Design a protein around this nucleic acid. Structure first.
Length: 50
RNA sequence: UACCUGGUUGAUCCUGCCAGUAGCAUAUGCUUGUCUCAAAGAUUAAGCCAUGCAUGUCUAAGUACGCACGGCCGGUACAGUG
């Protein structure tokens, strides 16, 4: 199940400033780039052995 | 530039030092118009210190929910400067 949709977003409301909601950058999350880094590491091991 | 000169005697040769003589280095005195380079609290006290400064640092690439600013949908985790 999606995890980014379940983060707590904090609301902001300043005098004169239009209102906005802000959410933190989720850490230790699995993204395509984490998998890409893992695959590149594994492939580097492959080329070393070869 | 491998150099000497005055002084012992009534006078003479000599030992021999004193003094002269030139540079260099620190201080000091007098004087001082340009211009270039340039040493400089070592000597006495490695004595004592008011105050200020002299060591900080972020990239695309460790960590950003500081509206501190800021976007184009404030129902798309993280837009960016920070």
């Amino acid at each position: 199940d999606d995890v980014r949709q379940y983060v707590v977003r904090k609301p902001l409301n300043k005098e004169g400033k239009k209102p906005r909601t802000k959410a933190p950058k989720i850490q230790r999350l699995v993204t395509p780039r984490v998998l890409q880094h893992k695959r590149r590491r594994i492939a580097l091991k492959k080329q070393r052995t070869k």
